[model samples]
Target: EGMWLMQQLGRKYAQMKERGLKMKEYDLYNPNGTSLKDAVVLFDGGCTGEVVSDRGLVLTNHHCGYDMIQAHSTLEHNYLENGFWAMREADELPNKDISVVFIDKIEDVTDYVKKELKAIKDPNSMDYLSPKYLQKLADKKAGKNFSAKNPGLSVEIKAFYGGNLYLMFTKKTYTDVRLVGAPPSSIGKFGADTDNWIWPRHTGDFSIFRIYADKNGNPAPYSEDNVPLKPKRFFNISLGGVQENDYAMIMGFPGTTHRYFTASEVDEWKSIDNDIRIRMRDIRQGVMLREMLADPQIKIMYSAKYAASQNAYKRAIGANWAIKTRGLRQNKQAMQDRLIAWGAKQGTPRYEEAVHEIDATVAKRADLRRRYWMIEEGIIRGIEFARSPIPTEDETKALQASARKEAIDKIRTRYSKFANKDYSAEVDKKVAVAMLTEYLKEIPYENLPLHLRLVKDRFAGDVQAYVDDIFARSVFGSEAQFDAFAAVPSVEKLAEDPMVLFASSVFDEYRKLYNELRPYDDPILRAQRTYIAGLLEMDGDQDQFPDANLTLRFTYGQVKGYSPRDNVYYGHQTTLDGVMEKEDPDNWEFVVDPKLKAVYERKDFGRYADRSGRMPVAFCATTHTTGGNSGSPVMNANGELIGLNFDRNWEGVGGDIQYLADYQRSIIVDIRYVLLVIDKVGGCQRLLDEMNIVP
Candidate 1:
């Protein structure tokens, strides 16, 4: 139930083998040479992906690649409404900002980092001990000579166990990743927000892409001359169905966890961070859904945005639910209490002191933290235009210096980000009106942005009228307005624009609050580090794994299921029959794709069907996972790719604080279903030919 690091694999190898690992630990992750780990990559920045073909064909969760899919979609070819399958390699869509990172090597650099840290003037400065700074030290150690030899090398250092240990990773990033195939939202995003964090799921949540490289098989930007990557390793997919209690393991980059948190920290997360996110997102998403349902165009434009919003909204809800129901706070307090007593007996009372320090600091920052979250979730995130880019000081100077044409052109370039195809002012205005109404209700008048303050002071708090007026008079109201304003540039006129002033006031207050809160970090960080060190000394370091911070981690267990309540057992797997049973053409989330429905009706699953004379859609396992584990490769006992790890049961969300092995399960898309969809629904049989499928 632990997300053990690649370096921790050796010690846990026997434990894994005892459970069910049939392959050597080296087959999982061999830093000295190629192994199954080489096939897994950190997908696009946050998610995980696996190379499934020698030509660098990758497989990941459908939601992980949703943004790229949306970006390439339009009314004419709405790839989201109708699924996209690149039947030919030439038709694959190249994504602009997408890239895949492969970890080439990892090394212990604890002593090297500490030796470099000795020169710092301020022992209290958090900057010197930060990950970014340590990464700089790592790069210095590697130097230009190593980089010259490794063209795409990226060196990074991460502090583990609250800075008690350090590890450096050498990585290679390939930027020419292209979108190869994706099921329509009806299939890929089946059940949508309604089924997000729950198990017994029927969603087939997988997407496919391919990596490209230069002739030398080295990392390179997109070019016509580039060829498919010749990867060091790729997974061999197993068509054999998973059975209950069979060995399963997941390897991926999990984003974050609070397993190291004290009781006070847990309270802070639940009350402030989770509560604020849940409340604010409800209001924002309500307005968005209402607008999206009214117009198909708006729906297409904001579908991706809405899904992303709901994803986090559900996570926050799940976390809060777990905290309230799971007795997490009391459990954490008991652990800290034990550590404090043990430390007192050992004549080191500083552990108790550290706990008190954290409690006091948390109380002191409660108000600031609430304000920060409210502002972030309500204004900055809720109202998209609130943080839209405006002309910087340098650009303003260029405008004032009478370089009018070039300066106006530059300003147009900046403004284009706001008026892009995906964004609609009408939708934003509708959303802004609702958000302003809700936000004003939450924030005190004293804390309102200056532009918003005008609503109460001069506009008589008629929030709708105030928002309407802003949109009407704002230079960013439309492309036509911006063009007209730029035709005859005026520094003062641009400065006085309503949207510009609104953005400035919001960000100015945002920055002010951010700087105000910066000083609170060092104290809390020091206390946490001390607390962690005391625990390590008492409990020993051999079994203490650090919390996740978006690093490659390996977690193993078995394909299993549990009852959410007494007398209501859920199975480890779901079938296409369950999908049919849940079908509702009246509801968009449950609407079955006709092609898929036909296949289900005709019993046409072919070799991908389970031996039970039914089509396997999804399965759940006892393996531990979190946010960044989406799209991770779930392997069998022999280290064969069996499924794509995509989600967790809502009851498992509290595992971020403490692993609930009994209740937690990693929801995975069966590789067999992935193949069936590509071959049946998509009719992209060539992809199946490219992959190495086994009996």
Candidate 2:
């Protein structure tokens, strides 16, 4: 389940064929013509998808496409609750901003980057090792070369295996993507959060969309003149079915992993950062969820927000638990011990120093790390501060008082209105109080923001009293007050505003502390890079796959089941029968539609049914995947669509840190299940025939 970049895959292609690949390397990746690589797109900047038909019908996970669904949803239509389908291409809704990036070409620039590193004064510093300088170099190349090849394509250069290697990727991103169809949450998110990463799963997480291009079929922004793209390659769905131990492959933009995270860094995150995120998110999510359940409009407004928050919140909990439970720290520490010993024998100063320096650096930065996270999570990063309007333009200071008032008023009015839209004051007030309460409790007196300390002292150590008072006085806390202020806005009035003042104080401290830690950044980067380099050298014969950085990657494994724990074996698949079994009208997450229940009771399984006459819903395989891999197609040995990859098993949360072959399985919705929903439950026959279905 190792995710190997396509270039690294050249040497492994033969070994892959030995394992089960039936196709040539050209079939997997070939710039000369249409191939498997041509069908896949980097979905919405953060997820993955594949072209399913010549008409450019793109398929990806429902959660991956949840933003567009939420954008178009309402209490009346409720596309999220009852799904959406466009029977014809004209009926398909166009999105103004969603995009899909296609991989055009990848060029290795390792030697070039290494040469530059050797020439730089402080080569070991972040200024040289960070990809920005290399990105500048790649951008120049793109301007002269790939940009000449195709002016429409964009360029990106990235570091691999820390700074040991580099690659430049030319991409063509189309912004004219349109929403086609998506199943209701009952099917798309069957068990919801309760069953998100659980194994014995039955969620059909697939969603449908289509790509569009200009008259010439070239990548362009969304416009009325744009037409459906005639894709060079698209998958032919295989209803031939999956069996135990069948070979599988997944290709996608996997977000990130910490495969080479130092033992000290692992321990630092486990002991410090993880619980903070889980706990803070739990409070905020709980507040949002309560209001959402209380009002249908709230649910519609915050559906995507809730999903996004909980997704990472849950992952944070699982990642730390995996790190601790699986003894990843100990494993890494053991490897470091070996690497240190091996480096000493090699007489390498840089390698041995990295091992000790990296470890000491992590320990030294514990206080700063805690403070950064506290400020990041509590103040600057999430709901409270993100909701505020802090102007960043230098030109604003140059405006005449009258002009300044008008401009500030315009922004204050718009931002405040946008921030307050679909917002419940009660919920936000609680979130503010909750976050500040945690921040005050977690950080030391000396490290606390001055404003926070002053407020706490004035309120006699009660965070609630101070925050409640701030909410009462701040226009930012009340739409009514904001509207009043906006009617006669001025710089002085804003400067005196409680929320504005509090935010300004906190943000300044955040910036100061963030900058203060800059000195350590380069050293840490250098140390970590050297350690990995030394570790690879010590491995001698084993391959060292680069950590994921939201780039295209391929991983292969077998269709297999796993044991989540002792005496608990999870089967590879779930069926409609299990859906009915899990249903409870009393709970929203488990409720099945009356019509769906009726079909299940009547045993109305169609061609989508397995040999046992039951429709498969989802399956799991030992393919390595992460957050960005959502909606990636799971192809069988013949490169025929079998399932759409969505999640990793709960026990396999450790896969991000270290791939657990025994537990790490990519949870996929069977493509057959996706078809059954479209053809039977959805009754979208017009769109069903658009796909090229395999016999």
| lDDT computed for candidate 2 | 0.81
Cα lDDT of model 2 by residue, 1-695, tens digit: 57888887777788789889998888888745667898999998899999999888999999888989989988888989999988788888888679998998888888877776776785555744556787777877667666667856978778878677788888888999999999998888887988877788888898999999987779888788889999878898999889888999999998888888778888887776787778778877887888888988888777766787787677787787678677888888888888878777878777768877877888888888778877887777445543466544542463424565656566667566646666656666777777777787888778887778865568888877777777788767676877776676556666676667677778888888888777776667777778777876778323667888999999999889988778988888888889888988888889896667777778776778999888788889988888789999899999999999988877788788788888789999999888988877788887678888887
Whole-model Cα lDDT of every candidate shown, in order: 0.88, 0.81
Which residue pairs clash in candidate 2?
61-631
TM-score of 1: 0.89
Which one is best on lDDT? Answer: 1
Total clashes, candidate 2?
A: 1
lDDT of 1 by residue, 544-564 (tens): 678898989999999999989
- TM-score attained by model 2: 0.90
